[PDB]
Design a protein around this ligand. Sequence first.
Ligand code: J8A
Ligand code: J8A
Ligand code: CO
Ligand code: CO
Ligand code: CO
Ligand code: CO
Ligand code: CO
Ligand code: CO
Lengths: 269, 266
Amino acid sequence: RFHSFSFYELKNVTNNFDERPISVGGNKMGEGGFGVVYKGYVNNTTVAVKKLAALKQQFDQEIKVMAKCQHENLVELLGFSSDGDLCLVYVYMPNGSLLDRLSCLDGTPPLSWHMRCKIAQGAANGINFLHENHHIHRDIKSANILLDEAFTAKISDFVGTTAYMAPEALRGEITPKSDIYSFGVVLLEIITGLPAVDEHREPQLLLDIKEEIEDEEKTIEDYIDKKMNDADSTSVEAMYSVASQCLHEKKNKRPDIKKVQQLLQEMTA
Amino acid sequence: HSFSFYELKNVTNNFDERPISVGGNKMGEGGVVYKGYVNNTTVAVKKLTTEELKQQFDQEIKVMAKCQHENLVELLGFSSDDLCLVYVYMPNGSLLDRLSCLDGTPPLSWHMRCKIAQGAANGINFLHENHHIHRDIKSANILLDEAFTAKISDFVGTTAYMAPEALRGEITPKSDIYSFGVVLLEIITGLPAVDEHREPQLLLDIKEEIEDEEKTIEDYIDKKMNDADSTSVEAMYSVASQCLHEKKNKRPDIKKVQQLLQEMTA
Ligand SMILES: O=C(Nc1ccc(CN2CCNCC2)c(C(F)(F)F)c1)c1cccc(-c2ccc3nc(NC(=O)C4CC4)sc3n2)c1
Ligand SMILES: O=C(Nc1ccc(CN2CCNCC2)c(C(F)(F)F)c1)c1cccc(-c2ccc3nc(NC(=O)C4CC4)sc3n2)c1
Ligand SMILES: [Co+2]
Ligand SMILES: [Co+2]
Ligand SMILES: [Co+2]
Ligand SMILES: [Co+2]
Ligand SMILES: [Co+2]
Ligand SMILES: [Co+2]
């Protein structure tokens, strides 16, 4: 069940929706339009308030999905306001996204291998919940994986992103198997610490490194994030194997999200 | 101090040639540098084409005897009876290791990168006043202690750090200044000096992209800092830019670099 929020209840708590960045002490921490995400504090809980701008029934279906969607590995919707803009209230995730932490943004220490494994397993569980409930994320990426106080993975969503998209998704297909492909790219980011796309890099797309390893021009060890001291070759190769299978160009020969969960658990066992 | 050979052999586990990450004593190639512990001191032992070497040994000692400074590595002794050189071990590895956060170590802050820059300059300044040419200034040659004090070491150039005139043969202190400019860009960007799978492959080339106003320095600043303010970053890029003048006579000397770096801290 959701809590009843007034627009003026949220306007007040976001400091009149302060549009200064949070780095300077303001309340705006996202321009992920359509809509703006502000930092707030309601019900003795830090929150992320999404003020939708110029679209109404997406505000509805986003509630329709987040109402039934309550899982340990998803973001949590606290409520909303339909008063005279429209806003949604999410619980704030202090540790930001997996992208920010993989790149060690703002000086945060590198995630360990063990922490990376757990986050991968968590992301799979959240994705599995979406698939079990016949939902397609369509925008699976490290920037959409948020982390809490305990660094547990939380699938979120602020078409898709080209560096993460499957061939069929690039051709218009809408399938859960496209999410499995996107997740495979994410699994490579976790292993390598590299962004999915780097304009000034060879290859420009992280998914291409799969080729250099298959044609034995490179090995997996050459690409492993050096910002780790606890990464053993066995489990790293295990996660790469899973990422390889997810990145099969033929959607029918990719594993389902359930097999991924299984393979990621056998990895740490 | 004079060490007997069997001494150093004992404390390096008989010169274990395996890297330290395997459980060996080898820290660098290639003579080879071994890790050892003797007389309340962790030490880096360098074990060194026959009598051509004996003066290379002496020259190193000759140069390192006169040179005791806060920002240079510390020669502890040697072994005359193979030939070995004993330096004081530096626990935080090189500036290169820490810029790339090797083995999960936390990113160096902007403030700390600045002090390391100043210290390295002071070490180069000391070398130049005593009429020495390093010939190989790189981030791998800048070691760090427990307090992250910059210590200049020497294990021609590397190519990614080399000045154009040095690439053609000229041996001058002005080339060290150029190589230092590349180190400064490393400090700013966190990027390695050369990456063959990168465009541009050479970090010194980003100087062109910026003065061609395609890109700005802010586009290259290391994301792994939260305290880097725009003013001092551009202040340091300015110093790096001047060091990287293709014309050796238009490059500042090491003393002007010191003054410029101190001016940046304010
Ligand atoms: O995820 C959101 N909504 C949503 C919408 C739909 C779906 C369903 N999909 C739609 C596609 N088809 C079906 C699947 C889902 C889904 F996928 F989760 F179910 C999630 C959402 C929206 C707004 C804000 C937030 C939000 C949460 C925490 C948070 N913590 C922050 N802290 C920081 O940044 C710290 C300063 C570093 S910012 C922040 N923002 C999250
Ligand atoms: O610097 C050395 N020799 C040398 C020689 C001559 C010159 C003089 N120039 C030569 C060029 N022409 C002008 C004069 C200079 C110079 F330039 F410093 F003056 C320096 C030297 C040599 C061997 C080993 C070491 C050494 C020290 C500490 C140390 N700590 C480590 N810790 C780790 O790796 C941790 C595990 C991560 S490895 C390690 N290695 C340093
Ligand atoms: Co209320
Ligand atoms: Co373990
Ligand atoms: Co370009
Ligand atoms: Co300050
Ligand atoms: Co003199
Ligand atoms: Co290649």
